[PDB]
Amino acid sequence: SVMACGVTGSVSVALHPLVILNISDHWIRMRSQEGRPVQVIGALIGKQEGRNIEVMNSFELLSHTVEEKIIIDKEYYYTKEEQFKQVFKELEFLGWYTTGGPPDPSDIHVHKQVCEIIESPLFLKLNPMTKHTDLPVSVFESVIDIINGEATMLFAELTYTLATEEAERIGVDHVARMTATGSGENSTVAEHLIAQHSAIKMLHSRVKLILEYVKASEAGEVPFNHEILREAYALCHCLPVLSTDKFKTDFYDQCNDVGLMAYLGTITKTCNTMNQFVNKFNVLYDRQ
Amino acid sequence: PSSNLLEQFILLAKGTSGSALTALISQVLEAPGVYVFGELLELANVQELAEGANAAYLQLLNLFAYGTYPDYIANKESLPELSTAQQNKLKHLTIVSLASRMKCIPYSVLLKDLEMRNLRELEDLIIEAVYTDIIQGKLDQRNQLLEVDFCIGRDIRKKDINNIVKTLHEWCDGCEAVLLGIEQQVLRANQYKENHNRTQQQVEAEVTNIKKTL
């Protein structure tokens, strides 16, 4: 077992969407080049302030498989480090990333080499073949444990956060809006409906937890969790948000306004098709 | 500090009871802050009082947990006489129930359900309840309506659980219905994309056939 049990995170890790995008691009291109989803290996850079680690950027590393062992081209890694020194100096190396499921007996050796490079490296692994709604990204640290009298390096999962700025928020929101738009129009409402589907599923899961807890309380558990079930009942009474004549007046007001706007858009599309039809018809038989 | 005092009273009720327990119940109903009485009702000494000879205080506690102000008015003889704090707390609980059931409360309902003869007294009680962080909302005097944005809940131990389970089941069924509806619309959108795609290669196949013809 390469995973430490009972070990809590000692440092805080902040991750940015750029790292995730770089990992995804590396995995996608390596899959395209060599068929199956070939595992990728890269490096993490950013700013570290004491126990607060912020991973702002990530890049790729050259690796070779010899004697069934992944050997990281640490000379390539240092050359690219000096290359990044020419563009960004405030960013310092923090760790390395890879793709896959649970840790394998090949990532331990790579993390051993990276810990040979720097003082304290961070290990991140992404799962591109996930099926759950959770983020398939986990951050692990290096811990030394005495197993059977021998010091064996293990991985301890870190309760990392995901930090972003206003700039990245706006940019990624724009990219999401673009993904709403299709090639010509591949899928536009599909992403929109799945987007609300995830939100409803998130709330639906919360309702199940409350419902199960009440059912258990009816049989066992605490007979009354006090302010919790009292409030849980109050939220089932607040569930029917009472609407008056004015709210339905305004709700129908908004629906009619944009519905008319939707009608105008259909007319604009229809006349363009008519204009294209007329232009083609004026060449089909008509002259002048 | 209402929760801490209620927990202390719970711990004391595990021991001393009887006449002392009635004094503790009176203190609870007189001390402001305790808006939830479900914690006290489940104590075994409350059941001991239920089999005990004294029942006026237990009926008062049961009405505070489940009943409202009109129930107390009807039971004005069978219940111990309340103080100003107890009456204000019971009126607050009644207003809480009204707000929980329906959010925009007309003044007529407030006057009818609370023996409020003067509307000024109604305004004073409403502002007192709001300022003690019990209910959050707004008042419309021109329409004589009390718009309550948020309110606390009531006690649930014996019979409201089935209604809560039914309400939770209805919410779960409604969420599943919307989830299925979204999936159907996504499938319909994919079919429309396929139909739009199907119309496409037919045009290119029509174009390429003529290109081969010429």
Place this chain on the structure above:
Amino acid sequence: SIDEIYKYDKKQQQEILAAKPWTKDHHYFKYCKISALALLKMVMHARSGGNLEVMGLMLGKVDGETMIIMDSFALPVEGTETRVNAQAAAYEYMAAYIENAKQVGRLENAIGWYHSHPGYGCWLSGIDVSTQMLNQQFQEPFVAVVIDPTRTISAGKVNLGAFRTYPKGYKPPDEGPSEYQTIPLNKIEDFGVHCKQYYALEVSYFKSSLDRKLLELLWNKYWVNTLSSSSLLTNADYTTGQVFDLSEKLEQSEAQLGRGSFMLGLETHDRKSEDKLAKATRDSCKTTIEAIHGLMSQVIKDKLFNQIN
């Protein structure tokens, strides 16, 4: 096949570079396909620290009339370009990056350059026109991409304008998009002078895997709360501006069409006037579908929360 575009065929690229079909037509390249990765990286670089004028190189390939951008990267700029051009130690960095990529996998070569226009619009200035003309001399094709970080906040979205220059002396046969952009007083002068010396490519984003990944991440962490009212579109400055711009575009189309009826035998006018009608209709349609999606999310959530049971 969503991932088919990621396959690199070196011999096919060499064959296209030996064929040089762009020499047969100055309007040869019409489309610009940008990877979600390259878009994000260029927008992130452009935003940098608020509104910084920065630039970089784009890696990619060509496919028929389409220019494909796969990746992007920046160059060292000691003292904010204290020397000529935003290059300084550029050559070294570029070559190093290229070889490193060839090793780790990336086999895509230089396809263009990108730079940012903080709050003045996506266009090519006299300097950028000359730069893309020199980029049409060396490295035969090349495309100039322009970003607006401050308009990603102002307009709310903003497109990444892709442009190609015309050779010295060559006149656009009729190409007239009649597209309006708000350009500052100290920038509109140069804009109008060199505006006809280039043309804009149609920018499109293949629905790949990098794009939907970002969409999921955002709507699973930050945009997971689909409340926020439901319509920030309610603020009638973006739609109304697009509506007013659409009105002006078609009004000019009618004025040209009315004057073009007296001239019998002007083929150029016909194509351009119908092109304007088509472009204006699409802008209305895209605005319409955005508002429709806004109410659809509104209706489903609002109906649920209020009267579910």
Place this chain on the structure above:
Amino acid sequence: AFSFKKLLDQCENQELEAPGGIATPPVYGQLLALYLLHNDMNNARYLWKRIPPAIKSANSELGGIWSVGQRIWQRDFPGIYTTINAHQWSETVQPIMEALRDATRRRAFALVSQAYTSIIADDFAAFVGLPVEEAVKGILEQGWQADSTTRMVLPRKPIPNEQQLARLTDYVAFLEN
């Protein structure tokens, strides 16, 4: 109403499929009375003009129905009610004639309620074709106001989610292509 509409459709079909081109007098009477019931004055007038004079001479009941229709066209409610109740209608005409009476009553009631903020009691009684005092009690149980001094009457003027989602999907699909 629904049964009357089905009967009207069946009678129209029978008229269209008439073997000799002339429908039976009961069918023509049903058609005319049902056209009067729906206040379709134009269709009733055209059907009456289409009927040959031989049927009219051989069936004075058809002439009576046409006179009732003419009264309906002039909208003289007292005369309409007097003419309807004056001629004996056969078993195939009496129930639909009473349905026409009820429809006229409802139409006059609605017209008075809408257009007349105030109306004389005699005028309202003439419009409804009923005596004044029981009309007053009927409108009082209808929640209206009546002034006894001036004899004036003051009438009181009175999409599912699945369909929406289908329309919303048709919004995107039309704009998607």
Place this chain on the structure above:
Amino acid sequence: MLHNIDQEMLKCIELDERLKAMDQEITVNPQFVQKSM
């Protein structure tokens, strides 16, 4: 009014589909193809 707007919609959508169908039929005409080729 919302239902009436949706009713005019379906007439417009059907009208646009008929317009697109004719435009496809126009493309089948050799005269357009001969000028295109």
Place this chain on the structure above:
Amino acid sequence: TQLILEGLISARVDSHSKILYARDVDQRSTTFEKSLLMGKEFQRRAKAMMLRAAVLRNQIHVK
């Protein structure tokens, strides 16, 4: 009344009490009404142009 017929007074004459009430109509109600009229006219003209393609594709005219 003549000024209202000509315009530029935007008024209504309540001849009951003889009081001149100014007209301030909501834009939305007028906008929706004329938008619906435009759509009906657009559909009607869509029919007419659709009809015109019939007589030309099928060569229909007076001989």
Place this chain on the structure above:
Amino acid sequence: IIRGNQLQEFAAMLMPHQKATTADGSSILDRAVIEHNLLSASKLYNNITFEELGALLEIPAAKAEKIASQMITEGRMNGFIDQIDGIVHFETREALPTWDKQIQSLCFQVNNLLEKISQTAPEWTAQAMEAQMAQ
């Protein structure tokens, strides 16, 4: 809302009378009391009549309307005054902002509840994990 019983202690504390050099403007204490009372009214009362507002503030209706108009003019209290019906419409947040905040408060209270069950009852979290793994 402020009554007239907190006046005494504050007035005694201020400057054995009122701060600065006395007040005599119906006391600055009472000016501030009326101003904060109208603020609290704007917090709750969407609209209010002259007589009821005066009774709430223990002042004549003319004084209440004058002080409300003065506060609105200075921008310290939002709203408008209608003199025919005697009704001062303090705040009206249309229909969307009221609905959005109620939903946001509802969702926040859901999140507060879920955190409370997980923290106060870690066994429920174990039960929740078991329940979600079973299904």
Place this chain on the structure above:
Amino acid sequence: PYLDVDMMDICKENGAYDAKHFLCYYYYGGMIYTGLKNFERALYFYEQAITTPAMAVSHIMLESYKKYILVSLILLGKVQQLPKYTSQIVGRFIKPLSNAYHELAQ
């Protein structure tokens, strides 16, 4: 039913379709719609009949123009202007002829 549907495909009748049938259909449909108090559709049919390009005068065409004038007077209160999509000698010869209806409109 069959008049409320727009029928945008005229049949050649293998070249035997004389536009006299077109004019007759539009005139009679306008008359039918006038009989059913459908003044808008009757006016539309009359306008379409008037706009038929014809190089000769026919009585059916003149009657269609007169009925168009009458329906325009009934519905809009005035004679709707004939479109610049226009026609042929039809209008040129009708306007002198239908002078009494123009006087009635005046």
Place this chain on the structure above:
Amino acid sequence: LVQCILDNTIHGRIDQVNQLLELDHQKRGGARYTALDKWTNQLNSLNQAVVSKLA
């Protein structure tokens, strides 16, 4: 009051029958629908003219 309203200083109007001054609160703050309606009618008529001329 009449002089002030004539000078456009007062966005209100006078009811002399009841000795009243009614001000237009204009709290709607819209006028976007007016621009939308003008845009709708002008271009739709523009489209109608183009179709008629092209045919």
